[PDB]
Amino acid sequence: GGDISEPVTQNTLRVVKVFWGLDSSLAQKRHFPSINWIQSYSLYSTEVGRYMDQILQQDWSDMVTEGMRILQEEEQLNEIVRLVGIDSLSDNDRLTLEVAKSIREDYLQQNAFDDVDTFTSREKQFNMLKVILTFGKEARKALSLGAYFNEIMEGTVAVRERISRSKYIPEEELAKISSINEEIKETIQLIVS
Amino acid sequence: MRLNVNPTRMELTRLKKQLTTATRGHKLLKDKQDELMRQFILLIRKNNELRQAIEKETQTANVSISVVEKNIMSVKVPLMNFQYAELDRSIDGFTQLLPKLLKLAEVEKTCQLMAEEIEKTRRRVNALEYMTIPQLEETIYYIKMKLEENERAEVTRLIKVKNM
Amino acid sequence: KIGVVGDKDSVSPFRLFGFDVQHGTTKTEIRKTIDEMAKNEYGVIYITEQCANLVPETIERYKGQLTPAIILIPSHQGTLGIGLEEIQNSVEKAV
């Protein structure tokens, strides 16, 4: 039935350190792979982060934690959308919802059928994560100055199409995902004035 | 009035949490409804006396505005800033309409924006109180009864296993 | 940014001021005026009630929108009594 309170799942989660909870709701939306990011958990998180921030020498530990926060916030902010509406309040939080929208749809949604997104190397796996939270703060950079969010969202759509594809670009040419980052550094220089 | 059968146990307590959130939400939207109404009635009395006045004055009878729209949580509210013998009398009576008919534009627009949003909020409160919450309560009861019966339906079987 | 719509005789005095005054007579193009009057950010639009019974739909549509601020006005003859109507049902709808 999908009920994880069964004896098998219960006795397993007592002698394991990693649990990837799947749910029919995501498999319904064809959100593959359907791992529920809110409850799924790994006790090896902190130590894996240490190893990987050394190997890649990028601030990976700081990135994965805040990338999860935008997801955590996304969950708490749809709780009100049912109640108050989309345009009702917390307008800057809409950016949070439309970058987490890209988190779950451009980064998390990993189809295992396509000939390139079947496997994503760690180095390439870095750029996608990198690109989205840059924008996540680049958005916050424009809402701090005063640029309306609808304007920026148009700037997104122009470059958001590119990151939607970022899954499909081959491993060797990572510079494409490295340079598209430079294009989103560009827009609110050309869209703020 | 039953929704759909989704028998699970931890789902019951998550539903109790969903119930308390619904009650919290219903509570918040109820005294939000009264505070929106509080100012609505305030502005109507300004609205009605401006409108009738406007009518009489009009009937006996670079200059652009910039409108930054202020806010009161749900809707935003507009504040109108202007940033510029019978022949002459008609033009001036007309000119006397200008500082008014625009102030009418202020009050009348704010009112209709408030009023529309009251209905939206009123719908949500009603839909939450009449549909959502009772469907939750009646479901957790039917869910509680199920596992109550299932528990002891197994206990009896176990006694049969015990008596083999 | 202010626009006004109605009969030339009653509304052309507004042209002394910077008001993009129209003389629309149509049921649909009045909307077409107001629709082009919608994508330009004209803060307020003044309307003679004589013209408003034509295209009632279009001012109910932007009624929930802040801009434009659609305003009913009497022309040189008189209002149709849109004030008696809209302040009466709006007060009761909320409460």
Is B102 in contact with C44 (Cβ distance < 8 A)?
Answer: yes
Residues 6+ apart with CB under 8 A from A184: A131, A134, A135, A138, A159
Is C78 in contact with B59 (Cβ distance < 8 A)?
Answer: yes
A136: nearest Cα among A92, A182, A72, A189: A92
Q: Which residue of B has its CA nearest to A80?
A: B25
**Distance (Å, whole) CA A82 – CA A94:** 14
- Indicate the burial class of B46 (C-beta count within 10 angstroms; 0-12, 13-18, 19 or more): middle
Instruction: For residue A117, give the amino acid letter.
Output: D
Residues 6+ apart with CB under 8 A from A93: A73, A77
The radius of gyration of chain B from alpha carbons, rounded to an integer in Å, stands at: 30
Q: Min CA distance, C43 vs chain B (Å)?
A: 6
**Distance (Å, whole) CA A134 – CA B112:** 41
The answer to whether B105 and B24 have CB atoms below 8 angstroms apart is no
**Distance (Å, whole) CA B108 – CA B96:** 19
Parallel, antiparallel or unpaired: strands B64-66 and B81-83: antiparallel
The angstrom resolution of this structure is: 3.3
CATH number for the segment(s) A43-193: 1.10.1140.10
Give me the residue spans of the domains in chain B: 1-164
Tokens 């219960």 correspond to what residue?
A10
Surface of B (49-88) touching C: CB under 8 A:
51-52, 54-55, 58-59, 62-67, 69, 75-76, 78, 80
Tokens 């149709």 correspond to what residue?
C80
Query: How many beta carbons lie within 10 A of that of residue A52, not counting itself?
Result: 16
The answer to whether A139 and A85 have CB atoms below 8 angstroms apart is no
Reported residue count of chain C is: 95
Query: How many beta carbons lie within 10 A of that of residue A186, not counting itself?
Result: 12
Instruction: Write the CA distances from B148 to A4, A181, B138, B144, B152, integer angstroms.
Output: 19, 57, 15, 6, 7
**Distance (Å, whole) CA C67 – CA B78:** 9
**Cβ-based contacts of B10 with chain A (< 8 Å):** 3-5
- Indicate the burial class of A29 (C-beta count within 10 angstroms; 0-12, 13-18, 19 or more): exposed
CB-CB: which of A2, A3, A89 is closest to B73?
A89
Is B9 in contact with A1 (Cβ distance < 8 A)?
Answer: no
Is B105 in contact with C13 (Cβ distance < 8 A)?
Answer: no
Map out the domains of chain C with their CATH numbers.
1-95 (3.40.50.10580)
Q: Number of helices (H) and strands (E) in chain A: give both, helices first.
A: 8, 2
Instruction: Write the CA distances from A49 to A21, A56, A72, A134, B152, integer angstroms.
Output: 21, 11, 19, 20, 48
A160: nearest Cα among A95, A88, A90: A95
Phi, psi of B71 (to 5 degrees): -130, 145
In order, the DSSP letters of C28-58 are: SHHHHHHHHHHHS--SEEEEEHHHHSSSSHH
Chains C and A touch (3+ CB pairs under 8 A): no
